[PDB]
Design a protein around this ligand. Sequence first.
Ligand code: NAD
Ligand code: NAD
Ligand code: NAD
Ligand code: NAD
Ligand code: MG
Ligand code: MG
Lengths: 254, 254, 254, 254
Amino acid sequence: MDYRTVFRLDGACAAVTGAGSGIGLEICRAFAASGARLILIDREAAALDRAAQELGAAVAARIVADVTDAEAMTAAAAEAEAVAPVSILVNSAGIARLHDALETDDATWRQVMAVNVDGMFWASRAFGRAMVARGAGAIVNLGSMSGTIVNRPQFASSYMASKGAVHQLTRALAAEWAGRGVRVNALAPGYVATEMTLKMRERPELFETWLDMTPMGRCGEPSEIAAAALFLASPAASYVTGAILAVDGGYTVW
Amino acid sequence: MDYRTVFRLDGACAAVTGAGSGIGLEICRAFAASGARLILIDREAAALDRAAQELGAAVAARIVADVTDAEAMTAAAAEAEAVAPVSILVNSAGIARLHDALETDDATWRQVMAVNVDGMFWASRAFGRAMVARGAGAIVNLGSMSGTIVNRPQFASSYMASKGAVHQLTRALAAEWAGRGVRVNALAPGYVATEMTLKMRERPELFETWLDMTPMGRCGEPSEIAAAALFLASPAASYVTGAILAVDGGYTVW
Amino acid sequence: MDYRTVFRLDGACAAVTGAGSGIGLEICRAFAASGARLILIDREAAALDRAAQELGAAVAARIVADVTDAEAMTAAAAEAEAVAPVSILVNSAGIARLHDALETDDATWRQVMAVNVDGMFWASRAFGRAMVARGAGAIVNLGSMSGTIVNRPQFASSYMASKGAVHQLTRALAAEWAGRGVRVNALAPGYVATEMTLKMRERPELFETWLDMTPMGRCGEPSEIAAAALFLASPAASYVTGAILAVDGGYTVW
Amino acid sequence: MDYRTVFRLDGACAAVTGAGSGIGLEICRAFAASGARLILIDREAAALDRAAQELGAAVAARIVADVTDAEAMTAAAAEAEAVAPVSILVNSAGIARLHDALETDDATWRQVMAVNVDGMFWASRAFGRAMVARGAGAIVNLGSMSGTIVNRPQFASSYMASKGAVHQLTRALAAEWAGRGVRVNALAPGYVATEMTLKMRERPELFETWLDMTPMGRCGEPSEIAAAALFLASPAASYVTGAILAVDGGYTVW
Ligand SMILES: NC(=O)c1ccc[n+]([C@@H]2O[C@H](COP(=O)([O-])OP(=O)(O)OC[C@H]3O[C@@H](n4cnc5c(N)ncnc54)[C@H](O)[C@@H]3O)[C@@H](O)[C@H]2O)c1
Ligand SMILES: NC(=O)c1ccc[n+]([C@@H]2O[C@H](COP(=O)([O-])OP(=O)(O)OC[C@H]3O[C@@H](n4cnc5c(N)ncnc54)[C@H](O)[C@@H]3O)[C@@H](O)[C@H]2O)c1
Ligand SMILES: NC(=O)c1ccc[n+]([C@@H]2O[C@H](COP(=O)([O-])OP(=O)(O)OC[C@H]3O[C@@H](n4cnc5c(N)ncnc54)[C@H](O)[C@@H]3O)[C@@H](O)[C@H]2O)c1
Ligand SMILES: NC(=O)c1ccc[n+]([C@@H]2O[C@H](COP(=O)([O-])OP(=O)(O)OC[C@H]3O[C@@H](n4cnc5c(N)ncnc54)[C@H](O)[C@@H]3O)[C@@H](O)[C@H]2O)c1
Ligand SMILES: [Mg+2]
Ligand SMILES: [Mg+2]
């Protein structure tokens, strides 16, 4: 094996949903440093305009699209594939909403499940079709430790349910496409210091518990999550499929 | 503890969704034999009437309702509570649809998720409200080995994803309601001989593999799932919450 | 199915290691109340003096033996079989030792693995032989949440390693004996109030953290564990083999 | 982050047990290519001859030792520390023996556990001591899919139990040493083409099942396991501790 290039993505084109912020943006930085071209996908146009400057020439296309709109995902894949064959997909678009179960508005349950699960399936179906047609591809889904355990003390049962579905969706597609050369894996991060968690990290009644139940005693930085996505997306992970990789500072060990 | 009676349900009233058929109907038989009175809930009115007739005096109410209708679930729990305090809920209503991921109509993905996950949350919120107000209750969710592994050879990614979300919804409500006396657990059955599976069991190209992949070499009967549901719904399981109990003939061992 | 007898053990003889204290003793009480006669196995004679005096006529034999002595297990099964066919085995003999990993003496590691893993294999091979020949049997092993997660704040790496081995021992024998009618399952309890934990529960610096990290906010009672073992040993669990059943007040859900 | 260098091991010294063959030897190749110096540890002096002549100046020391000999592992860590600080430990020494449970002699069970579990503890205690003192290190343990599921059709209950202990030993040391900067993770490979499996791969009555039950339809190459071990040993895995990373071609997805 050539280990000095096994983690690189030279020649590849990767689509990333949720590319305008947070983990998804950091994954774009990791993938551009590793030689990939990028299809940036996000619902928020101004975030894509910022990303595309921090990324420059690695950027092959910039597609404003809602992952919950199935037809917009199938259009996004066809737009991307006219630019370059897309061999990597990262599903990072996702949302998290706090709600107590007995006081849950129906729309909040529905929205969290639509972005985190349904939109991951529309994007994986859209982009996975040409990968299956080529007989090669790699998908990396953003699961969570919340697909394995339940967070404390805050409540958000739609988020835990949505991430249990992401982990099984990952595994389902891994099994169905394994014979067709497309690997599908998920990260299960612990708390990460981004745009999704900053409001809760400013309430000591949550944050002190979150650190106390992490053996490493800190949140992860986005780059620690992006380095693991780069491993799963690269040829170094060529025998890894259907895996749920904990990247959580030990949270799920206790 | 009086082991003589710890598995009984005398004086309890249990609500069962999916009570008209299959596992749900057999759990109603088991619960009535254990002393419970019953709230039967099912979308199919003839199957409900036929269950209500068979169960006789054990039936406290018969409610024709769709679990995907959150308003209908809230109304069903108000109707039930007017008859008797409901201290057990079994969410057995569920559907399975075969589909190849790249040939998936959108409506199939959506409706499997609506029944299997959203309906379970609507019903659990609706009936759990009075359990939490009373400081006591037990919920048994029908998960599946498909929430832990992926079936073979047939494809149904929406079913796998739905059952991952069932297992984590179970756990999320177990965590949220632990301190107010409501236990929430899931069964994860292997193949069971019900109407859900009958067409597929009639296809040797499926069924031979099913039996070859089960260490016990046979498909479970509904009574073998209902006995495990009775365990989890009874006081014998008073320290069991958030558990996913495999009842699969060993399928998930291999 | 007759649900009113499906959890009973009438006519059975159950061998229970660790019968002199704690969970094993309470399992003896539960199985006697369920119609079984008992083979009490413990290396503490004085504890078998007390347990036999309480259990009275349910006792078919009392055997002072060390489960780490393979030859004494093979002889114990032959001594039991001479009195009655043993159709249930409960492996509850076990020890826990607190130790810093880097300063562990070789003897502590070896002691804990010998009792908790090797002894469970020697007893299972010894008692399982005649079960396999009869085509019928049930074995219940005492795993732990410590086979799934790692306890805090106290360290006991040999205990965690031994309970990971218990869980996979259980599943290995469930797979190998499934076609010959012997089911093998494990309980994975959370903290239980027995002599194994009494002086640890008297150290606030441990006990406060144990309760804080259990969603139900209390230790389990030995009867709560014994009811779950009675489920697994009974015909109600006829479709359950290779399962690891958490009985932990929700500890592994967080 | 500089993703260009985050997978490198420049300046590091890694000790590898089982370096003489298979996965351990391929990990030494991958580690040498990534800038590390190596401490080769194996019981086989003729295998060490071959490995050392290939790896050349990458070798800081070669030590003929049995990992089951606790004193030899303590002496190896001292010998290695006198050459360079050891900041990475790979526990790859391991054995597999086929045995039916009821025909198992006691010495087979003991020695599989002694190499696979006890020797991993002795080696991690010995080498881990200097890492914890420095407040930095990474350990990668060779677990297996056999710590999660049970192989078929061949029986080897001691191997399954040993690998369950490996996964929980990994997690216990990750929790105990997380505050001291030492990460501890395990790989859980599917079948890999090495000398451990050569005889079984040459038996169609095993091998056809192994391929049939792997979604990828092939065994893994040692390099595919070494690249994963390099990920976990490197700073790219800086937020990964106590993880069990499946590298199994999808085996554990079904
Ligand atoms: N931050 C964490 O602690 C953490 C922990 C574990 C898992 N995760 C998961 O990682 C993923 C990314 O999290 P993040 O912290 O980067 O979040 P973020 O809020 O910083 O970024 C999410 C991005 O997704 C986009 N997005 C949201 N909904 C969309 C939609 N319907 N269509 C298209 N784009 C959409 C947003 O515009 C945004 O740019 C999510 O799935 C999240 O659940 C985050
Ligand atoms: N049969 C199996 O092999 C198996 C295995 C594992 C898990 N399960 C799960 O167990 C549960 C019961 O399965 P089963 O085999 O008894 O199925 P079944 O088809 O025999 O019974 C399902 C019942 O649910 C009712 N139902 C369906 N959708 C509904 C809705 N929207 N609102 C109200 N009622 C509705 C149906 O009318 C029917 O009476 C399901 O969640 C299923 O996924 C079944
Ligand atoms: N108490 C708990 O919190 C807890 C939690 C989870 C799992 N467990 C497990 O449950 C099992 C029973 O625990 P417990 O709380 O009843 O412990 P206990 O200490 O109260 O009882 C253990 C019994 O096993 C006997 N025993 C110990 N080593 C033996 C050997 N070598 N040979 C024969 N007999 C031996 C002891 O003499 C004693 O009577 C153990 O495997 C333990 O690890 C306990
Ligand atoms: N090959 C596979 O399919 C596979 C699959 C999953 C996990 N594993 C695990 O990966 C590890 C390496 O396996 P492999 O395929 O490279 O095996 P291998 O047999 O090719 O190499 C094992 C090496 O360990 C050495 N060794 C054995 N016992 C020892 C002892 N007591 N002290 C010192 N050295 C000793 C051997 O001499 C040999 O050089 C083992 O833990 C194995 O269980 C292997
Ligand atoms: Mg936990
Ligand atoms: Mg499997």
